[PDB]
């Protein structure tokens, strides 16, 4: 039988919200997988909030790291998904970093997907 994959999660004690998720980004006309990870919402020195996604590995690869802008596109779609548009950091295309990218945040349940959509909209306002 395939071996179990054990991961010592990278913890973010300073986050006020943390949910396991799967991330995708729209290129051509497909949503390409970015990996399974954990979405973190952390404080800043300002009233702005940090949107952080670390991969489900021992190294906690930073898949996304962005301040939530006030007019961030944010919409609820699907069974358990939340769409957003932002200038990705780390960049997805090094040549055209400045171009916003449409992104899909999947979570396990529709209820906790509805929750992610709520608190994100709450933090756009600040």
């Amino acid at each position: 039988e395939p071996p179990k994959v054990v991961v010592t999660e990278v913890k973010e004690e300073d986050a006020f919200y943390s949910k396991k998720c799967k991330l995708f980004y729209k290129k051509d006309n497909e949503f390409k997988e970015k990996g399974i990870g954990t979405l973190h919402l952390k404080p800043t020195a300002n009233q702005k909030t940090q949107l952080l996604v670390r991969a489900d590995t021992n190294l906690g690869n930073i898949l996304l790291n962005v301040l939530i802008p006030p007019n961030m596109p944010c919409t609820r779609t699907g069974k358990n998904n939340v769409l957003i548009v932002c200038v990705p950091n780390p960049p997805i295309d090094e040549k055209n970093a400045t171009m916003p990218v449409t992104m899909l945040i999947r979570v396990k349940t529709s209820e906790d997907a509805d929750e992610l959509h709520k608190i994100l909209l709450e933090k756009k306002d600040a």
């Binding site: 994959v5 020195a45 940090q50 590995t57 021992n58 301040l67 919409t75 950091n89």
Partner: protein, 211 residues
Amino acid sequence: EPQVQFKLVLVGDGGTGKTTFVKRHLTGEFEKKYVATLGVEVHPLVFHTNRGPIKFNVWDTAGQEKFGGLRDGYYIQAQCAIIMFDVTSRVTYKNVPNWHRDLVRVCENIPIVLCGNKVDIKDRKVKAKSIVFHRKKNLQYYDISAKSNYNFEKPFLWLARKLIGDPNLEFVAMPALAPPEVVMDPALAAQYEHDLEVAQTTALPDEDDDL
């Protein structure tokens, strides 16, 4: 940009998943479709350790004979290497000694890791008891799966310990420092939020219950 960097050459039969393993470390992507590599693709991998940063300049070579060309250039000045095969394809393991010869011919005594990929697949053909190629002090073996990320960081961690001379070197996570805020045009943002709400041209991915 780390000052400490090493040239790492990655070889093995075509289809064994060499590129998919690099993308997992590079971007977290996993592409189901098989698109063969043409020539070589060089990607930098940065790892944070307890002793400071390390950069591996990974030379991801093509495994197919018709796509690899003459491989001597890819190997010269290589300071480490990874050989890969597919545990669901016994032939890819039969050819491991051939890849080992080519590497020792051009690079001599470099630390090398043997990686048996696709251990996430149930019907395994090359089992661990059968794998007995590794016997030397500069060779190591690991089971990995670039799909399930089994033994994700082991090949690089072992190479970094040999290259640095510290058996106790450990990889650590990179801190996520607050990024720069990016201001968007309000009208443009309104148009994006509208396109999201109505424009659903791209189909939502299939719902694997991975989470």
